[PDB]
Amino acid sequence: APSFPFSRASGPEPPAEFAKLRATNPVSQVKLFDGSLAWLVTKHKDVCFVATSEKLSKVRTRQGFPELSASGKQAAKAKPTFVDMDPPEHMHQRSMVEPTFTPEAVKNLQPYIQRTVDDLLEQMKQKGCANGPVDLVKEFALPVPSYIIYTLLGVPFNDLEYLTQQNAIRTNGSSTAREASAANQELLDYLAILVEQRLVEPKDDIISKLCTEQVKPGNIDKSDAVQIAFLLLVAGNATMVNMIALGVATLAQHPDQLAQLKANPSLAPQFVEELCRYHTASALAIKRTAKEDVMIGDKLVRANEGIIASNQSANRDEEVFENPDEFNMNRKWPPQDPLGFGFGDHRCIAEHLAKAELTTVFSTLYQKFPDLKVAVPLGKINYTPLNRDVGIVDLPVIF
Ligand code: HEM
Numbered sequence: 257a258p259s260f261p262f263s264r265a266s267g268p269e270p271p272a273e274f275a276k277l278r279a280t281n282p283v284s285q286v287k288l289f290d291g292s293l294a295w296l297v298t299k300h301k302d303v304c305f306v307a308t309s310e311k312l313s314k315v316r317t318r319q320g321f322p323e324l325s326a327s328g329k330q331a332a333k334a335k336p337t338f339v340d341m342d343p344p345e346h347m348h349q350r351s352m353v354e355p356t357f358t359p360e361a362v363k364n365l366q367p368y369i370q371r372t373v374d375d376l377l378e379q380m381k382q383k384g385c386a387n388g389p390v391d392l393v394k395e396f397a398l399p400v401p402s403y404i405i406y407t408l409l410g411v412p413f414n415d416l417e418y419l420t421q422q423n424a425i426r427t428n429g430s431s432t433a434r435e436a437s438a439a440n441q442e443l444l445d446y447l448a449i450l451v452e453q454r455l456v457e458p459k460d461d462i463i464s465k466l467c468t469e470q471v472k473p474g475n476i477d478k479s480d481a482v483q484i485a486f487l488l489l490v491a492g493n494a495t496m497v498n499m500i501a502l503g504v505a506t507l508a509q510h511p512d513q514l515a516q517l518k519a520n521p522s523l524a525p526q527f528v529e530e531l532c533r534y535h536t537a538s539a540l541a542i543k544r545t546a547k548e549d550v551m552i553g554d555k556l557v558r559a560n561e562g563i564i565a566s567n568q569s570a571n572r573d574e575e576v577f578e579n580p581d582e583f584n585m586n587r588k589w590p591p592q593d594p595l596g597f598g599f600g601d602h603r604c605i606a607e608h609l610a611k612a613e614l615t616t617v618f619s620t621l622y623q624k625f626p627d628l629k630v631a632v633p634l635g636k637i638n639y640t641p642l643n644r645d646v647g648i649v650d651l652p653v654i655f
Pocket of ligand 1: 496567595602607
């Protein structure tokens with residue numbers, strides 16, 4: 257059994273193994289870091305099955321859950337939030353915060369998202385490009401998602417820059433285990449204080465809703481409001497940062513796609529849909545443990561055996577998406593949907609918010625900077641290490 261995670265074929269490409277497994281052995285076993293075996297599903301149809309089956313469990317404490325690293329095993333002991341819950345507890349907790357993430361709530365959030373994006377682009381314009389290229393990640397890609405999520409949670413405006421920097425520390429590769437954990441408690445400590453405030457004097461934010469509707473009524477504890485708040489902040493922020501950078505790098509790679517977008521910004525939604533399929537920035541999140549014997553294809557997964565469904569592989573499934581390795585914003589979409597944000601009950605709570613943020617970024621970026629270009633040769637872009645999810649560490653740009 258080959259060890260998993262697999263390494264990406266190159267900077268922007270998915271692991272080479274998936275294409276082979278899809279063709280010759282769709283449901284197979286891989287070897288995890290601790291020597292244990294898990295089943296890997298690679299076909300779109302099977303990933304959808306794994307994400308919806310009632311015979312499969314998301315509980316991380318269950319012996320058999322496929323942890324991918326030693327640290328992941330230590331994180332499994334902490335008190336679970338809805339992300340690690342099965343029905344009926346899952347929707348019970350997820351429904352407490354989901355109202356802010358609905359399609360309509362996000363539609364009413366558009367003027368704000370647009371304003372935030374405009375302001376950061378304006379700052380980057382004042383910052384200058386005179387003494388050399390700017391890092392698009394620290395100056396734009398990082399602040400955009402952070403300020404928004406922080407503001408939705410309830411963080412004061414003047415605290416955004418410092419808090420955005422700290423959250424970046426947790427996921428920074430050049431960060432010691434020391435620095436990462438001190439950043440975690442810093443944020444955790446701040447959220448707990450914010451919870452104490454909103455209980456006294458609530459506001460128009462996610463924390464005040466939790467305090468008013470769940471904490472006061474005795475539905476959940478104070479520390480529960482803190483854990484949910486923290487989950488919402490750390491869950492997909494790093495992924496959003498990467499998606500923005502990946503979008504810019506992808507447009508530099510295909511001048512034709514860029515030309516179209518510049519000519520018609522209204523194509524941003526189409527660009528965003530293809531980007532989330534093509535670049536599956538979160539490919540190791542759909543993991544389950546069989547609660548009972550289940551047959552997937554010609555395999556039979558026994559009770560208590562772990563499963564990892566690759567949505568990245570599913571997004572490149574020739575059987576579903578024609579010319580899956582070609583990046584085409586003008587692609588004709590099949591009835592089956594891309595799995596960039598998951599599938600089933602655990603499908604990303606922030607899917608609509610994420611797409612709104614990305615659509616605003618890509619329908620504005622090139623209108624502000626029509627001559628924006630990656631200053632380093634494409635082959636030299638500093639992508640994340642091959643053994644992990646696709647991303648870009650820094651992106652020098654001129655405009
Ligand atoms: C474009 C960026 C994003 C991508 C590609 C992404 C992707 C994913 C994926 C693949 C899953 C699905 C796992 C499953 O099906 O079980 C997921 C779950 C989740 N995401 Fe994201 N996400 C993004 C942005 C966000 C943001 C901004 C937030 C924060 C508000 C967030 C919060 C969550 C949470 C809380 C879950 C767990 C939902 C549940 O288990 O019910 N994600 N995300």
